[PDB]
Nucleic acid binder design. Structure first.
Length: 612
RNA sequence: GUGCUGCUGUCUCCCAGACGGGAGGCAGAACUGCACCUUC
DNA sequence: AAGCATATCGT
DNA sequence: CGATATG
């Protein structure tokens, strides 16, 4: 089934027995060795229970007379490893009054009426018992009234606080068979044959980043009015009507301050390492002394003192200033939700990632300064500090999780608003990137799971040359390095520019809808006589060679203008397509550099910008 | 409920030691904001 | 590894 | 509808 969980708090033996159950399953048994094999089989199974009682060793003495139910419940809990209360453990009666729950555990001694602290997850809940041994909860996590079914409850104790896990089933939104057939059609290579969707679906091309948290483009099959036209496999062209950029920088000053402080904390650790070398060794190597003066001093924004005694004092003053600036930045980041800026605060912004990078850099700087004392041979000790920078780590993990949840919610919202039912995302599996903050697959897994729960199917497209190829001419352009938000291409021999993220979003959507009709790069090797044999590993390359040459293999034969061509063969060096001539690696880079030189002389003022 | 997520006063513990940093406990002031399958 | 179903006897 | 017992 599909499950969702949240906790409620109840304020005013089951563990004594849960711990006993865990230990018993792992480890009255007067001669445990003599019955070791059976015990092991039963514990591993958690029919065995029936066999154990026949042996006459299965009855035991529970820490606290749990009679039955509670007993079996805790047993199953330890197994799975939550003192559970089932309705088919001791039965419970979950009701709701006002804005809070009321759990009534039916213990053998009597009824235990427990009121729960009003949660903002199960806000304003309504509970009605069903005929299927369940409770139908209706709550508010807008005023969307989420619905769930509760059949089992669990009790735990954290820091002397008792918590109830309301693990409830829910029904994901209905997904049409047209969406499934359309995904099957569009995901398949051109070699295979799949039925057409035969419906007017909606496709959302998505590019993921950190500064533009994500950008999207929307297309509707069989509906082309105005926008960047894209071919569709075996159908008519479609126009990307809604193209947008979500996320982004909230306030420029805050982003700049986080970047500056992250750089300062990045260089501080290396500066104190070099100062520790200077205080101990007394001299530096040629590279380090050049590195310290040229890079570390202007980076840490410190004044280099020759005296080693007051060098530590200057370093401590600098670290105090760094911490004061960090506290100011954190307070300004907190105030986005507690001023008149409540309305203009975005769901997700570029500061959610800059703050994480700053937290990591400051953690490193503080961990380095705290160990400024150590000298030759101190190293690390089994003990020392058992909770060093615990608050920092807690904040980093909590902010990471919250950023992931808010990004997933933003993506899902944007997909639902635009009516999309198919979402082509970029396969980020294939610093200043989403990686080094999360696992490459974790973000994708979360996003597709939430989209599926909302009834939207998602597919990962190969993200190769999407940010370097124009979405109109389907040719290589210039991605500006001074400003990474402008992508320069040529059209009718006139240089145009576009947003470099909606460009990649449209390229992702185009690759999805055209079923990878065109490839911008081919891997080949030189056999002899200037003939570059094409290396075919992916099925997409096999389909591409069939459509252009006519055979599942081909070679690059040279021409006069340092270019190549596809021929085809009857039965490892990159090559970039360019204008149908398959320029080699060096010539492709030369062409890109020529484009960059041409666009730098022209000036962006005379370069028109297309709709975005 | 869990976080985003902090401020002020005061107190305790630790590492340098006399420039500073890291765990936490209470008491207050402001805020009605966003998101959340937890659990192992 | 987890976060229940049916089935009939007896009263 | 309660008491087990097993899909």
């Amino acid at each position: 089934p599909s499950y969702k969980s949240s906790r409620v708090l109840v304020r005013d033996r089951s563990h004594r027995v849960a711990a006993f159950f865990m230990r018993l399953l792992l480890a009255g048994c007067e001669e445990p060795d003599a019955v070791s094999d059976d015990l092991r089989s039963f514990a591993l199974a958690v029919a065995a229970a029936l066999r154990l009682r026949e042996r006459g060793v299965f009855p035991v003495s529970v820490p606290e007379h749990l009679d039955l139910d509670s007993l079996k419940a805790a047993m199953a809990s330890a197994a799975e490893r939550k003192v559970r209360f089932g309705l088919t453990g001791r039965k419970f009666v979950l009701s709701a009054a006002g804005s809070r729950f009321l759990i009534t555990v039916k213990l053998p001694c009597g009824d235990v009426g427990l009121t729960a602290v009003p949660s903002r997850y199960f806000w304003n809940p309504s509970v009605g018992r069903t005929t299927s041994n369940s409770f139908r909860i209706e709550f508010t996590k807008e005023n969307r009234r989420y619905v769930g079914e509760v059949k089992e409850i669990g009790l735990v104790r954290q820091r002397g606080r008792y918590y109830f896990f309301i693990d409830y089933n829910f029904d994901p939104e209905e997904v049409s068979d047209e969406t499934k057939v359309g995904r099957a059609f569009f995901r398949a290579p051109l070699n295979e044959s799949r039925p057409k969707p035969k419906d007017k679906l909606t496709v959302m091309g998505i590019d993921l980043g950190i500064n533009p948290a994500f950008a999207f483009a929307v297309c509707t099959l069989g509906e082309c009015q105005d926008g960047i036209r894209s071919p569709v496999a075996k159908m008519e062209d479609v126009s990307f009507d809604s193209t947008g950029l979500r996320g982004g920088i909230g306030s420029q000053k805050l982003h700049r301050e986080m970047h500056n402080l992250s750089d300062r904390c990045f260089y501080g650790a290396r500066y104190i390492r070099l100062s520790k070398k200077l205080r101990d060794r007394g001299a530096l190597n040629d590279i380090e002394a050049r590195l310290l003066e040229e890079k570390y001093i202007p980076g840490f924004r410190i004044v280099h003192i020759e005296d080693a005694d007051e060098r530590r004092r200057t370093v401590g003053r600098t670290v105090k200033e760094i911490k004061q600036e960090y506290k100011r930045i954190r307070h300004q980041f907190y105030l986005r939700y507690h001023t008149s800026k409540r309305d203009r605060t975005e769901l997700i912004s570029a500061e959610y990632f800059r703050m994480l990078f700053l937290v990591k850099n400051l953690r490193n700087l503080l961990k380095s300064w705290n160990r400024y004392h150590w000298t030759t041979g101190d190293r690390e000790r089994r003990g020392g500090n058992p909770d060093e920078l615990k608050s920092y780590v807690r904040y980093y993990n909590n902010l990471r999780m919250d950023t992931l949840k808010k990004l997933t919610c933003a993506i899902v919202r944007t997909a639902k608003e635009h009516g999309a039912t198919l979402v082509a995302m970029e396969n980020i599996q294939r610093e200043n990137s989403l990686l080094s903050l999360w696992a490459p697959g974790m973000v994708l897994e979360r996003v597709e799971q939430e989209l599926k729960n909302e009834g939207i199917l998602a597919w990962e497209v190969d993200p190769r040359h999407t940010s370097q190829t124009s979405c109109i001419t389907d040719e290589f352009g210039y991605r500006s390095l001074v400003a990474k938000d402008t992508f320069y291409f040529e059209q009718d021999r006139k240089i145009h520019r576009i947003d470099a993220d909606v460009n990649a979003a449209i390229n992702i959507a185009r690759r999805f809808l055209t079923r990878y009709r065109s490839l911008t790069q081919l891997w080949a090797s030189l056999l002899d006589d200037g003939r570059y044999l094409v290396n075919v590993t992916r099925q997409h390359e096999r389909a591409y060679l069939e459509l252009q040459t006519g055979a599942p293999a081909a070679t690059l034969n040279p021409t006069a203008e340092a270019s190549y061509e596809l021929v085809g063969l009857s039965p490892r060096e990159p090559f970039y397509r360019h204008e149908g001539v398959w320029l080699t690696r060096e010539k492709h880079r030369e062409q890109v550099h020529e484009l960059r030189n041409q666009v730098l002389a022209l000036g962006n003022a005379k370069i028109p910008e297309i709709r975005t």
